[PDB]
């Protein structure tokens, strides 16, 4: 019944910049076959911020027509208005998505817990009676919006069955450990690989993982089975030298032989040939 392992699925682009939907679906099927319980579309690693509001509708519809069960799909929602967050969430939930991965709004800076509580509440009200299965996304290194333990408690208390978990990508164990003690009744999912297995052993329900795009079984052992893997921790450090999402895509290409993954959407830029060789070398030293 736990959340388990979800791939933070990468989004492949053709040379003309459009989404390669067949390649995307095939990659999802591979990740599911290799140990993911679900795939998360349009998250950070998916460049979801860069995927249009019409594109995401086309992609979700195509995934469902291709026969991937909606209950094996999580959709990231990374927008700044109540209306758009509710609309995107409602559409995915109506389609049968397992969960929404909902970021707080990320335009205004230095926002208060009270402001955030009110925003989430307004989104949930706007979704309406069908609201369910929202995982709130704590990724302050990207959004510059922390979801405090206290805020998570306020949300859980007010919205039982609606706020069902937290994706904690803070890399702040002092925070994560409190999420587990106070809110481990929810699905507490852990972004920082060094504390993933540790957190699973303390009741964490898994991960929405970028590395799981190319080391699925290895991440599953951590996220589901609660087993450490120092090689994964080391890989993530070795890759700090490079933009995270473009480097993950380089390793999808390296492990699969699929050249499509090279390409990223602006405002990201391609990893250079020399830097790709460094990334592949770091991977090979650990896993090949």
- Show me where the chain is broken: residue before each gap, C-N > 2.5 A: none
Residue 238, number of CB atoms within 10 A of its CB: 17
Q: Taking CB under 5 A as the rule, does residue 87 contact Mg ion? A: no
- Residue 109 or residue 129: which is nearer to a copy of itself going by CB? 109
3-state secondary structure of 50: helix
64 vs 268, beta carbon nearer Mg ion: 268
Q: With respect to a copy of itself, which residue has the nearer C-beta, 231 or 265?
A: 265
Q: Which residues bind a copy of itself (CB under 8 A)?
A: 17, 49-55, 78, 80-84, 87, 104-112, 114-116, 118-119, 121-122, 141-145, 243, 245, 265-269
Q: Cα separation of 152 and 173, whole Å?
A: 16
228 is a contact residue toward Mg ion (CB under 5 A):
no
Q: Which of 80, 87, 182, 234 binds Mg ion (CB under 5 A)?
A: 80
- The site for Mg ion, by CB under 5 A, has a size of 1
Q: Tokens 């910049």: give the residue.
A: 17
Of 119 and 261, which has the nearer Cβ to a copy of itself? 119
With CB under 5 A as the contact rule, which of the stretches 10-18, 74-82, 178-186, 189-197 interacts with Mg ion? 74-82
**Interacting span for Mg ion (CB under 5 A) from 79-87, 124-132, 196-204, 234-242:** 79-87
d(Cα 236, Cα 17) in Å, to the nearest integer?
28
Q: Does 113 bind Mg ion (CB under 5 A)?
A: no
Q: Locate 141 and state its tokens.
A: 């290194």
- Rounded Cα distance between 255 and 148, Å, is 37
Stretch in the footprint of Mg ion (CB under 5 A) among 39-47, 80-88, 133-141, 242-250 = 80-88
- How far is residue 44 from each of residues 138, 185, 191, measured CA to CA in Å? 12, 25, 11
User: DSSP character for 153?
Assistant: H
User: Alpha helices, DSSP H only, in the chain?
Assistant: 21-33, 53-65, 82-94, 113-127, 140-143, 149-158, 173-183, 193-201, 216-223, 230-238, 244-256, 273-287
Q: Give strand pairing partners of 168.
A: 138, 190
Residue 84 as a binder of Mg ion (CB under 5 A): the answer is: no
Q: In the bound complex, what is the minimum distance in angstroms from residue 243's beta carbon to a copy of itself?
A: 8
Q: State which residue, 80 or 182, has the beta carbon closest to Mg ion.
A: 80
Question: C-beta of 124: minimal distance to Mg ion in Å?
Answer: 20
Specify the stretch interacting with Mg ion by CB under 5 A; choose among 55-63, 77-85, 138-146, 178-186: 77-85
Binding site for Mg ion (CB under 5 A): 80
């Amino acid at each position: 019944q736990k959340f388990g392992l979800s791939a933070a699925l990468t989004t492949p682009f053709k040379t003309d910049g459009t989404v390669d939907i067949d390649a995307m679906i095939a990659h999802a099927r591979r990740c599911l076959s290799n140990g993911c319980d679900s795939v998360t579309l349009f998250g950070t690693t998916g460049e979801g911020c860069s995927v249009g509001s019409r594109e995401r509708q086309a992609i979700l519809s195509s995934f469902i027509a291709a026969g991937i069960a909606p209950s094996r799909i999580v959709t990231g929602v990374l927008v700044d208005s109540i209306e758009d967050a509710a609309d995107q969430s409602a559409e995915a939930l109506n389609a049968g998505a397992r969960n929404i991965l909902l970021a707080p709004p990320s335009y205004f800076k230095n926002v208060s817990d009270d402001g955030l509580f009110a925003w989430f509440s307004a989104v949930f009200s706007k979704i309406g009676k069908d609201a369910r299965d929202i995982l709130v996304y704590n990724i302050p290194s990207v959004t510059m919006v922390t979801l405090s333990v206290e805020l998570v408690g306020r949300l859980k208390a007010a919205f039982p069955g609606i706020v069902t978990g937290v994706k904690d990508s803070s890399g702040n164990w002092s925070h994560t450990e409190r999420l587990l003690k106070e809110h481990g009744d929810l699905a507490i999912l852990i972004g920082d690989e060094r504390d993933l297995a540790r957190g699973v052993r303390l009741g964490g329900q898994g991960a929405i993982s970028g590395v799981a795009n190319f080391l699925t079984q290895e991440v599953r052992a951590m996220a589901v089975d609660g087993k450490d893997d120092p090689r994964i921790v080391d890989l993530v450090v070795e890759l700090l030298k490079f933009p995270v999402t473009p480097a993950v895509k380089v390793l999808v290409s390296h492990t699969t032989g699929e050249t499509i993954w090279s390409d990223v959407r602006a405002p990201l830029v391609a990893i250079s040939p020399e830097d790709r060789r460094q990334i592949e070398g770091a991977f090979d030293a650990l896993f090949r």
